[PDB]
A paper describes a structure:
S1 adopts dynamic conformations in cryo-EM structures of prefusion MERS-CoV, SARS-CoV, and SARS-CoV-2, wherein RBDs adopt either a “down” conformation that buries the receptor-binding surface, or an “up” conformation that facilitates binding with host-cell receptors. By combining cell surface staining assays with cryo-EM structural analysis of MERS-S41 in complex with the MERS-CoV spike trimer, we have demonstrated that MERS-S41 inhibits MERS-CoV entry by blocking binding to the receptor DPP4.
The four different classes we identified showed that MERS-S41 bound to two distinct conformational states of the spike trimer. State 1 represented a conformation in which just one of the RBDs was “up” (42%), whereas State 2 corresponded to two “up” RBDs (58%). The MERS-S41 Fabs showed full saturation with one Fab bound to each “up” RBD regardless of the state of the spike glycoprotein. The Fab-bound “down” RBDs slightly lifted up with an additional angle of about 25.4° in class 2 and 27.7° in class 4 between the long axes (yellow lines) of the partially lifted “down” RBD and the horizontal plane, comparing to the corresponding non-Fab-bound “down” RBD in class 1 or class 3 (with an angle of about −13.7°). Notably, the partially lifted RBDs are incompatible with DPP4 binding. In this binding manner, MERS-S41 could potentially prevent further conformational changes to a fully activated, receptor-binding capable state with all three RBDs “up” rather than only inhibiting receptor binding. We therefore think that MERS-S41 recognizes an intermediate state between “down” and “up” although we cannot rule out that the Fab would induce this transformation.
Numbering used by the authors:
A (entry chain G): 1 to 212
B (entry chain C): 386 to 626
C (entry chain F): 1 to 24, 32 to 221
D (entry chain H): 1 to 221
């Protein structure tokens, strides 16, 4: 069992910039016995380099295996939006074989202004289940997008739950889906539901409107 | 001396030493290594100590005492089937010995290892045929296996050239914990010539049966192929030496 | 090239015996904890019949690979609740070359002694205000489903593009929900609006609904 | 236990000299006689001749006398039967079996067999026909795709599924004579995988007269 150090992880790398990944080994390992695996978000890992010397068949040669004995470096000659993935270095020199801590790779091409859509709940959920309130923030890239719910044009406590999808392989953009849970019975005085987004994209907090 | 030099190999990688025309002493081999277990097939162990044969074959490897039962021609154990086989037709004596602490210059392998299974796929997609080692032959599957198996569980695969047979050859490696004192297994496969026995027990002529101290006594003499009955007297050298 | 596929994700009580089946060299099993590095569990070769296990998972996992069956089966017995993880089966080159070229889709095993809830599809509620003609924003929401993962696809999975899927986020309640939204070129209904097929592997409940511009 | 192997099936003209070779693997011949048995297609077995390699003694059936010469070479450990001026009706599969003794004339082991054909016609190389896999089939329960061997004059072409003979789900249909002299037989396999399969290219075919091996990819149409 060899414990292995890894690069810090999330990094912002522009396209066309070389990316270097470090895989130091605490315990001595074979000079050419390391495997690099790249997994796309929600996708199984695929081997890139075997033995840290030659690329696997069907794998782009932009990723290069370098370094020996203790530190193994993976260098990518060109970066594309489809290069954004988690990379793990696995040492099979010592059994049990130990996978790397992994490093997330983020590719930023340009800042994208967010598009905000407000979804007003249908009467069908009033009959069964909780109608709730939902706010969509499509193309809000980068990941740092903040939405706060507004109820009846009055300040609302931040009890809302927000989920942000990982960047698309080609789009390289992040979309957010904030949701507010409110009691089905408690829908009387409140008339307007809105989500206010603060982001680098857009001139100012883009608030919204329900009425209906 | 060649058996003593170096480190003894694994049972599959056993080295072979063959003696055709020399006097042999079993006791000298027994003195070097204490014999934990002695067994022989087709001849008595006492008989093997002092009899002439056309040729003597000795196979030397490091084999632990615990798995001795597995390494038998009668046994169906995998170690006999995929590692070392001794020919049944010629009488075979099998000896398991443990190195003495006093003995020196015997290097010890990291751990004893054996080929768990040896097989060739007749058809790559769904057909596997087990291959049993032929008598001796230094193991056909040995080429994929390293001299000492790296792990208790190991997978080895290689592909034969097509035409022929273009079929994948696969081997497995298993290891056992090294004993504090090295244990070595020796296989002897003597064969007898119909009219000629080149190798004989030491020594062909006894030290007691010598001309010296028999002077003044009528004695039968067999010197260098000259046989006669005569009396020997010491005297000054005469004729060409 | 051999394609590698795995059994549907199964929710099991702790102390159960999950048999994850990797359908059709050697088969290696890797356990990845969520948001954690992958851990190798075992190396079983069907042709050899040999079995290898990691020291941590020893005597609790029985791994059987048969060449005649052509299917690799891993059985985990008395697994702890913390053991819940996504399990992947990876092809093994050999002891000389321990690298996995092909990986299975993966099976998520959950080990909580609670309750399993069938997926509930909340109203699409398409936005009254969206792009007038360029795009119309409509999404069917799946909520109140206890066990991951429910898979929701527009056009019965025909539409693999233009669909945004959001990972389930834990709320105060134990049950968690995820969101699926799609963009349609025709803002007013469009040629076909009957979509939103949903598949829940543990529940085995499939719900299909039609979107209406309100 | 000695495994018995025989020469590949040979097509001969009538009145030719045909030698069928029976061999023991490992080049080992014990004190066991070698005997020859003739089976006509859809007919009972017959005894043709007995040869012992150790003594060189040869005996033949009354019907086949002066036309059959049986020779067994002890050093070669191979037994050969020679038929001279054989009639067209003589065509049959020939089997070599092991004798036990004068009071033990029972055949413990039998050779794979050699088919001898005696027609003055023509020999045609096997023509593979489209697999034509059915468009409609069970959804993963089974898929039916079969490469067809057609227009081959001399038996027997051996067609093996998967290029290594797959025991599971293999169906072979006996050749039936066509109106033309050449005859055709059918090979089909069932695969659980809906598409591609373990191997894209399979269907090895071997014909003893042609000496040609053909492998074709299977495509789901």
């Amino acid at each position: 069992e060899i414990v292995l150090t890894q690069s810090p992880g999330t990094l912002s790398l522009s396209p066309g910039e070389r990316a270097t990944l470090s895989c130091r080994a605490s315990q001595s390992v074979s000079s050419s016995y390391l495997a690099w695996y790249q997994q796309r978000p929600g996708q199984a890992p695929r081997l890139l380099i075997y033995g840290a010397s030659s690329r696997a068949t069907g794998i782009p040669d932009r990723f290069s295996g370098s370094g020996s004995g203790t530190d193994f470096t993976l260098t990518i000659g060109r970066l594309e939006p489809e290069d954004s993935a988690v990379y793990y270095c696995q040492q099979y020199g010592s059994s049990p074989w130990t996978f790397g801590q992994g490093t997330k790779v983020e590719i930023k091409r340009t800042v994208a202004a967010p598009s905000v859509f407000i979804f007003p709940p249908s009467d069908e959920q009033l009959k069964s289940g909780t109608a709730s309130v939902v706010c969509l923030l499509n193309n809000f890239y980068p990941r740092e997008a903040k939405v706060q719910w507004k109820v009846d044009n009055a300040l609302q406590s931040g009890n809302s739950q927000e989920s942000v999808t990982e960047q698309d392989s080609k789009d390289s953009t992040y979309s957010l889906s904030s949701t507010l849970t409110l009691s089905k019975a408690d829908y009387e005085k409140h008339k307007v539901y809105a989500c206010e987004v603060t982001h680098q994209g857009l001139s100012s907090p883009v608030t919204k409107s329900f009425n209906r | 001396s060649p058996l003593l030099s170096g480190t003894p190999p694994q049972v599959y990688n056993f080295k072979r030493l063959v003696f055709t025309n020399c006097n042999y002493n079993l006791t000298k081999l027994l003195s070097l290594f204490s014999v934990n277990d002695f067994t022989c097939s087709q001849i008595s162990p006492a008989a093997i100590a002092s009899n002439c044969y056309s040729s003597l074959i000795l196979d030397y490897f490091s084999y632990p005492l615990s798995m001795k039962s597995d390494l038998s021609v009668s046994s169906a154990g995998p170690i006999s089937q995929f590692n070392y086989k001794q020919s049944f037709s010629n009488p075979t004596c099998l000896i398991l010995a443990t190195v003495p602490h006093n003995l020196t210059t015997i290097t010890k392998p990291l751990k004893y290892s054996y080929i768990n299974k040896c097989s060739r796929l007749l058809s790559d997609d769904r057909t596997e045929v087990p291959q049993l080692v032929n008598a001796n032959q230094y193991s056909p599957c040995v080429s994929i296996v390293p001299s000492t198996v790296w792990e208790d569980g190991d997978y080895y695969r290689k592909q034969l050239s097509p035409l022929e047979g273009g079929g994948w050859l696969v081997a497995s490696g298993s290891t056992v914990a090294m004993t504090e004192q090295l244990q070595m297994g020796f296989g002897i496969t003597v064969q007898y010539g119909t009219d000629t026995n080149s190798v004989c027990p030491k020594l062909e002529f006894a030290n007691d049966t010598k001309i010296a101290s028999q002077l003044g006594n009528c004695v039968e003499y067999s010197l260098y192929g000259v046989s006669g009955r005569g009396v020997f007297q010491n005297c000054t050298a005469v004729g060409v030496r | 090239q051999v394609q590698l596929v795995q059994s549907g994700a199964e929710v099991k009580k702790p102390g159960s015996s999950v048999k994850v089946s990797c359908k059709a060299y050697g088969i290696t099993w890797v356990r990845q904890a969520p948001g954690q590095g992958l851990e190798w569990m075992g190396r079983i070769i069907p042709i050899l019949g040999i079995s290898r296990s990691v020291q941590k998972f020893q005597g609790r996992i029985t791994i059987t690979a048969d060449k005649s069956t052509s299917t690799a089966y891993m059985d985990l017995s008395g697994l702890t609740s913390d053991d819940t993880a996504v399990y992947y089966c990876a092809r093994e080159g050999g002891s000389g070359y321990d690298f996995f070229d092909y990986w299975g889709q993966g099976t998520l095993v959950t080990v909580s002694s609670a309750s399993t809830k069938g997926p509930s599809v909340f109203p699409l509620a398409p936005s009254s205000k969206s792009t007038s003609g360029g795009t119309a924003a409509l999404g069917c929401l799946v909520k109140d489903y206890f066990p991951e993962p429910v898979t929701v696809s527009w056009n019965s999975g025909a539409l693999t593009s233009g669909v945004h899927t959001f990972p389930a986020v834990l709320q105060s309640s134990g049950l968690y929900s995820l969101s699926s939204v799609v963009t349609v070129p025709s803002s007013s209904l469009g040629t076909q609006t009957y979509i939103c097929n949903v598949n829940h592997k543990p529940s085995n409940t499939k719900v299909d609904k039609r979107v209406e511009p309100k």
